[PDB]
Amino acid sequence: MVDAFLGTWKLVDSKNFDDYMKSLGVGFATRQVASMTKPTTIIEKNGDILTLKTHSTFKNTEISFKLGVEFDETTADDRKVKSIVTLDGGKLVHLQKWDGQETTLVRELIDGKLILTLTHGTAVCTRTYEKEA
Numbered sequence: 001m002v003d004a005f006l007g008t009w010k011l012v013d014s015k016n017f018d019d020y021m022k023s024l025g026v027g028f029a030t031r032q033v034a035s036m037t038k039p040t041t042i043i044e045k046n047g048d049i050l051t052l053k054t055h056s057t058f059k060n061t062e063i064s065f066k067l068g069v070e071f072d073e074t075t076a077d078d079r080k081v082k083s084i085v086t087l088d089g090g091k092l093v094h095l096q097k098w099d100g101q102e103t104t105l106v107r108e109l110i111d112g113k114l115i116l117t118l119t120h121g122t123a124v125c126t127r128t129y130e131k132e133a
């Protein structure tokens with residue numbers, strides 16, 4: 001039931017991303033660049049395999065994963081994590097686990113916009129994406 005997430009999305013709003021990055025220990029110079037970067041997220045499916053690409057002028061990432069099946073991931077900030085993505089309440093919930101820590105990356109559709117909520121520790125960041133043709 002992931003179909004409405006699929007496509008190409010552009011960042012159009014960000015709240016508290018610096019807080020989130022700082023909670024994860026990202027260095028100030030990197031946070032400075034990241035705060036001014038507007039990534040493009042591409043979400044594709046091939047049967048029950050999703051691929052999620054994040055493209056920007058700074059860093060790119062790509063993950064592929066089966067819904068509800070754990071996968072190894074190396075994050076943009078070089079954390080080596082155990083990840084799982086599942087559909088929960090109509091949201092794509094990506095949970096990353098490493099060193100007993102956790103962070104969630106939750107995507108929900110609200111009025112045709114894709115809202116990404118990032119939570120680590122007490123930091124909660126909300127990033128809004130709009131669909132590109």
Ligand SMILES: O=C(O)C(F)(F)C(F)(F)C(F)(F)C(F)(F)C(F)(F)C(F)(F)C(F)(F)F
Pocket residue numbers: 020021022024026039041054075076077105116118127
């Ligand atoms: O897709 C997005 O909009 C996003 F927020 F930029 C992000 F790519 F998910 C991200 F959170 F920045 C991240 F790259 F995944 C990150 F978590 F790795 C990090 F940069 F925030 C960290 F702080 F962890 F390094």
Ligand SMILES: O=C(O)C(F)(F)C(F)(F)C(F)(F)C(F)(F)C(F)(F)C(F)(F)C(F)(F)F
Pocket residue numbers: 021026027030031033034035037039054055056058059060061075076077078
């Ligand atoms: O610590 C880092 O070096 C990092 F995680 F790679 C990052 F630079 F923070 C970063 F994630 F690239 C980013 F800058 F935060 C970003 F803004 F590029 C991103 F999050 F947008 C994207 F997802 F593209 F990596």
